[PDB]
């Protein structure tokens, strides 16, 4: 059973579900909107080998980022052109990891699903590379797996980026 | 709780869930198959800036469309070659928006999830760029976010393109 | 309602849900981890036309596979370079189909969703091209639709690749 | 989860729950009202030994019955008194069995609870003295076990007597047997 | 699905379920305890004909009432006996109506079942003789139908008398009417 | 949602619901049958004041008991009459407490309702006169409150007497206490 607006308000009120920060205006019919943080990670190894520790760089943006499809073949001129034309602070191609602003904690009787915002899906911008279910008992911010699949997309710091859908478990989990 | 075949039939019969047009042969064990419309939208701005109104063109196909991966680098000869060889009316690379034929209306106690057809997923054709949950209270056709990730894929007007999975809400929503 | 750890154990114990092979250590709070088989399929036609029978080749790996993004433009030297450097048995670009090791059977009152592992989503490796719901009554292994979206990714035979999330149906289905 | 009005109507429409006769105005917010049949059974035995087939009398009322508490000590004179004064067809004391007019069939994913109606409970008249849950798979009319606990109560043929409350099962039941024809 | 303590508290906090007065220490694992009011009704009629408005007496106890089984045959001498010996304000036999102190309102997605408390059931005292389900949408106090089935039982003003068990409906109910003002 | 047979078996197998002794043939479509113990309690007090520990007698039947309605006025001669004629070990009138043979433990996500069996209800014999819901977290045998409302009824040691109906809670309950050892 998916929690309605009224249920989300109740579980937040009683601290069954922690959402920090919380804005009641982000509660929809059956979801909670989450927002985009200013910190991103970009990987800088040649391949991804999960048996190893991954090398990465951390980027923080002031206002906005332009996410280009892989193989957009960005040159120095092109990046400056985009910065001047679209007022973006950073221009990336391919995958970039982001984060929600929101920190959540789930109880033992709820699982949540992250999904990217519909308006961004309609411009072929994804912020999750999986169906996005989150274990009962989870604590943390949500890591966003951002990729553009058609043309470059501007993302703004603090914009609504996606939503959490909360489902009841049939029984409490042991975590 | 996900609605079974029998539940979908009941909710359609009593107009709790509106599906127009409806075909009882499209009811599966726990989903309803939806079909591909003949109208598509292609964006024609340089980047996507959601703070602005987006420029687009509307395309209608007679029978079929060939959806090529981004950076397939289509030339005039290549497009004609594909049209002659595969009898497609239109050839696109990268993202294209489509629509279901079906118009739906959801009540305050149901949320639905769109998912693309399995047989199309197995040829790396996606028709949704998000997990695809639809708010309780929604009214409309479903916008399809179509991208091919391996080789070009032929899509046919009116083919089964994906399915709707309907879940009960824990409580009625206020929309 | 999503099945918890305890529910999954119960339904496996009573053979309501078949999972072969089964490892109780793969039961999480509200999911079951599945693993990557050694057999893959690669398509070898020019385009995908689902009205036709598709031509493909079968590949079996000994230990590992390097999955490169589409348009990585692999040459003979580059493939050897990757094999020597990363000890992979096979190097592919674009889409490849895989399989879980696990064979499942779902009863008439359960639907399951496949999702790819979070740690792989964070390196822009996907193993499903759809939301991944599986009909009540399904019998089979799970076909994996593998694509890398950022850099090449090493996948290991038998690694945990994703998870199954099981939901109750509101009523039994007629399949 | 308890079926609402909307659910009851759906399940009756698709023949998932059979109710014969069905009256749509008997659907409440989360229950279905049932009505009192005109046939009743009164046992005639000194003690009830379930190893036996009990002896009984059947009666059919033309319109109404007066049900008196146990030990009301009904003589022919008191019976005619009541019949004359209140125009009842029959006067009984102690337990009387009745039946709903309604015949039901429950699917393998529903259980139902019968309850006697509140307005009769308010005058200490019951039509069941157990909780009243009915197995998934059940097919039949509902047997009513009618007892008055304070003063005699008039009941009328075809009156609403109680309600069925329908609950979803967590999983489909084995209703105890399977039949495969062809 | 039955609401747990956690759920009851949530629904009371947001005013989805109204309970007036509310005592948080009356929330159990999966129910809410209700308490006995000091006003009671005793009918005064030879038979109960629901076509009529029944005649009754209202009483208010200062602290306690002795409820005797039907046919206990209470004379003024036995009444004063009990009053003197057990310090009760009133002695009655047979059925007596009472009320909860608590006023409730149920939303369109909840039904509740009243049950008399176990410790009173253990001495054959009931405060309802039907199953006790209450419609979604209900607003009111709970009417208690009190009967002792073995020996007389002392009840006290404001004591916990029973519990409400709350269940989710599968879908929202049409509570039978809609009101649109502006 | 009410547990089906399939669910009951699962929860007993994993020790989520304890039932001791367990008989798999007592699992019905959506309930578990329980059986009547051979020990009974009869109170010996003029009135029941819950502020006190009530006085009682314990009895153990070798095979069977005749339970008579209240005010059946049992003399030694009538008792031996019944004992001789129906071969019962004990004859009682009015309320008698019994117990299930079965000991249960409920987890924090389940509540159960006891109901007396239908075939006994059909002869106006009850083994509970409240709705019978049991808290999540409960551990124990089930106390039976047995009353016959029409004629005396024979009950036998170890007979099926009623059923437990198990419901999921919407959320886990605080069962009222937490114990942390090490």
Asked whether residue C120 is marked as a ligand-binding residue, the answer is yes
Rounded Cα distance between F126 and F124, Å, is 6
Q: Are B85 and E147 in contact (CB under 8 A)?
A: no
State the DSSP string of C77-136.
Answer: HHHHHHHHHH--SEEEES-EEEEEEEEEE--TTEEEEEEE-HHHHTTTEES-SS--EE-T
The pair of structure tokens assigned to A16 is 């069954």
Backbone angles phi, psi at A172, to 5 degrees: -65, 140
Integer-rounded Cα Rg, in Å, for chain F is 18
Query: Distance, in angstroms, between C16 CA and closest chain A CA?
Result: 16
Resolution attained, angstroms = 1.4
The pair of structure tokens assigned to A2 is 């998916």
Number of neighbouring beta carbons within 10 Å of residue C67: 28
CB contacts of C111 in chain A (<8 Å) are: none
Mutation site, C12, C14, C170, C172, interface F, largest F CB count within 10 A: C14
Indicate which residue of C76, C77, C105, C145 is catalytic.
C145
Angle, helices F5-13/C5-13, rounded to nearest 10 degrees: 100
Q: Which residues of C touch B (CB under 8 A)?
A: 1, 43, 45-51, 54, 70-71, 94-95, 97, 108, 111, 128-133, 135-137, 143, 145, 147, 167-175
Specify binding-site residues of D for dCTP.
117-122, 128, 132, 135, 143-145, 163, 177
CB contacts of C16 in chain F (<8 Å) are: 6, 10
Please name the residue that has the structure tokens 């991804």: A48
Number of neighbouring beta carbons within 10 Å of residue C104: 22
Query: Distance, in angstroms, between D176 CA and closest chain F CA?
Result: 7
Q: Chains with 3 or more CB pairs closer than 8 angstroms to D?
A: B, C, E, F
Task: Show Cβ contacts of residue B50 under 8 Å, excluding neighbours closer than 6 positions.
Answer: A119, A120, A123, A154
Bridge partner residues of D112 (DSSP): D134, D166
| Selection from E21, E171, E15 nearest residue E108 by Cα | E171
CB contacts of A66 in chain B (<8 Å) are: 47
Backbone angles phi, psi at E110, to 5 degrees: -135, 135
Q: Are F162 and F116 in contact (CB under 8 A)?
A: yes
Rounded Cα distance between A119 and A32, Å, is 15
Asked whether residue F119 is marked as a ligand-binding residue, the answer is yes
Closest by Cβ to E30, choosing from F46, F50, F173? F173
Q: Are B44 and B108 in contact (CB under 8 A)?
A: no
Q: Are A5 and A32 in contact (CB under 8 A)?
A: no
Rounded Cα distance between E46 and E95, Å, is 14
The pair of structure tokens assigned to D103 is 């015949």
Task: Show Cβ contacts of residue D15 under 8 Å, excluding neighbours closer than 6 positions.
Answer: none
Q: Please give the DSSP secondary-structure letter assigned to residue B157.
A: T
Q: Please give the DSSP secondary-structure letter assigned to residue C5.
A: H
Indicate which residue of F39, F105, F145, F179 is catalytic.
F145
What is the domain partition of chain A in residue ranges?
A: 1-175
Number of neighbouring beta carbons within 10 Å of residue D80: 11
Q: Chains with 3 or more CB pairs closer than 8 angstroms to E?
A: A, B, D, F
Dihedral over Cα of C1, C2, C5, C9: its sign: positive
| Superfamily for the A1-175 domain | Deoxyuridine triphosphatase (dUTPase) (2.70.40.10)
Number of neighbouring beta carbons within 10 Å of residue A81: 12
| 3-class secondary-structure state, position C166 | strand
Number of neighbouring beta carbons within 10 Å of residue B76: 7
| 3-class secondary-structure state, position B150 | coil
As to burial, measured by CB atoms within 10 angstroms (0-12 exposed, 13-18 middle, 19+ buried), residue A79 is middle
CATH class belonging to D1-182? mainly beta
Closest by Cβ to D150, choosing from E1, E94, E108? E94
The pair of structure tokens assigned to B101 is 């034929």
Task: Show Cβ contacts of residue B125 under 8 Å, excluding neighbours closer than 6 positions.
Answer: B67, B116, B146, B147, B148, B149, B153, B155, C48, C129
Asked whether residue F105 is marked as a ligand-binding residue, the answer is no
Q: Please give the DSSP secondary-structure letter assigned to residue D3.
A: P
Q: Which residues of D touch C (CB under 8 A)?
A: 108-109, 168, 170-172
CB contacts of E136 in chain B (<8 Å) are: none
| Selection from C20, D128, A30 nearest residue E133 by Cα | D128
Query: Distance, in angstroms, between B21 CA and closest chain C CA?
Result: 23
Method: X-ray
| Selection from B44, B62, B78 nearest residue B155 by Cα | B62
If phi over 0 gives left and psi between -120 and 50 gives alpha, with beta otherwise, what is residue E175?
A: alpha
Q: Do C123 and A46 touch (CB under 8 A)?
A: no
CA distances from F159 to D170, F7, F154 (A): 29, 24, 11
The 3-class SS string of chain A reads: CECCHHHHHHHHHCCCCEEECCCHHHECCCCEEEEECCEEEEECCCCECCCCCCCEEEEECCCEEEEECCCCCCCHHHHHHHHHHHCCCEEEECCEEEEEEEEEECCCCEEEEEEECHHHHCCCEECCCCCCEECCCCEEEEEEEEEECCCCEEEECCCEEEEEEEEEECCCCCC
Q: Please give the DSSP secondary-structure letter assigned to residue C51.
A: T
Burial D40-61 (b: 16+ CB within 10 A, else e): bbbbeeebbbbeeeeeeeeeeb
| Selection from B51, B64, B140, B132 nearest residue B96 by Cα | B64
| Cα dihedral: E139, E141, E145, E147 (round 10) | 150
Please name the residue that has the structure tokens 């009671």: E40
| Selection from C110, C165, C172, C97 nearest residue C139 by Cα | C110
Backbone angles phi, psi at D124, to 5 degrees: 65, 35
Q: Are F10 and C13 in contact (CB under 8 A)?
A: yes
CB contacts of F168 in chain A (<8 Å) are: 170-171
Query: Distance, in angstroms, between F147 CA and closest chain D CA?
Result: 10
Q: Are A166 and A110 in contact (CB under 8 A)?
A: yes
Indicate which residue of A39, A53, A93, A145 is catalytic.
A145
Q: Are D166 and D17 in contact (CB under 8 A)?
A: yes
B21 preceded by a cis bond (ω within 30 of 0): yes
| Selection from D43, D67, D31, D59 nearest residue D160 by Cα | D31
Asked whether residue C53 is marked as a ligand-binding residue, the answer is no
As to burial, measured by CB atoms within 10 angstroms (0-12 exposed, 13-18 middle, 19+ buried), residue D35 is middle
Q: Are D27 and B14 in contact (CB under 8 A)?
A: no
Task: Show Cβ contacts of residue A39 under 8 Å, excluding neighbours closer than 6 positions.
Answer: A58, A59, A60, A98, A99
Indicate which residue of D39, D46, D145, D179 is catalytic.
D145
Backbone angles phi, psi at E12, to 5 degrees: -70, -40
CB contacts of E6 in chain A (<8 Å) are: 14, 16
Please name the residue that has the structure tokens 């509307």: B58
Number of neighbouring beta carbons within 10 Å of residue B24: 10
| 3-class secondary-structure state, position C26 | helix
| Selection from B8, F63, A113, D10 nearest residue C136 by Cα | B8
| Selection from E147, E45, E48 nearest residue D68 by Cα | E48
Rounded Cα distance between C59 and C64, Å, is 12
Q: Which residues of E touch D (CB under 8 A)?
A: 1, 43, 45-51, 54, 70-71, 94-95, 97, 108, 111, 128-133, 135-137, 143, 145, 147, 167-176
Backbone angles phi, psi at D77, to 5 degrees: -70, -40
Taken as a whole, chain E contains a residue count of: 182
Q: What angle do CA F143, F148, F149 make, to 5 degrees?
A: 130
CB-side exposure of F120: number of CA atoms within 13 Å? 25
Q: Do C6 and F16 touch (CB under 8 A)?
A: yes
Rounded Cα distance between D41 and D18, Å, is 25
CB contacts of C108 in chain B (<8 Å) are: 29
Mutation site, C97, C115, C145, interface B, largest B CB count within 10 A: C145
Rounded Cα distance between E93 and E66, Å, is 8
Rounded Cα distance between D85 and D95, Å, is 23
Rounded Cα distance between A79 and A68, Å, is 10
Q: Please give the DSSP secondary-structure letter assigned to residue C24.
A: G
């Amino acid at each position: 059973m998916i929690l309605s607006d009224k249920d989300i308000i109740d579980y937040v009120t009683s601290k069954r579900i922690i959402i920090k920060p919380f804005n009641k205006d982000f509660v929809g019919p059956c979801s909670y909107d989450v927002t985009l943080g200013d910190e991103f990670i970009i990987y800088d190894d040649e391949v991804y080998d999960l048996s190893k520790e991954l090398n990465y760089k951390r980027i923080k943006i002031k206002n906005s980022i332009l996410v280009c499809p892989l193989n957009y073949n960005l040159t120095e001129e092109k990046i400056n052109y985009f910065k001047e034309k679209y007022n973006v602070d950073y221009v990336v191609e391919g995958g970039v990891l982001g984060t929600t602003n929101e920190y959540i904690e789930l109880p033992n009787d709820i699982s949540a699903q992250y999904q990217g915002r519909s308006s961004l899906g309609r411009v072929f911008l994804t912020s999750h590379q999986t169906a996005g279910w989150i274990d009962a008992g989870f604590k943390g911010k949500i890591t966003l797996e951002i990729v553009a699949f058609d043309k470059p997309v501007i993302l703004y710091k603090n914009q609504r980026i996606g939503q959490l859908i909360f489902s009841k478990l049939l029984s409490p989990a042991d975590v």
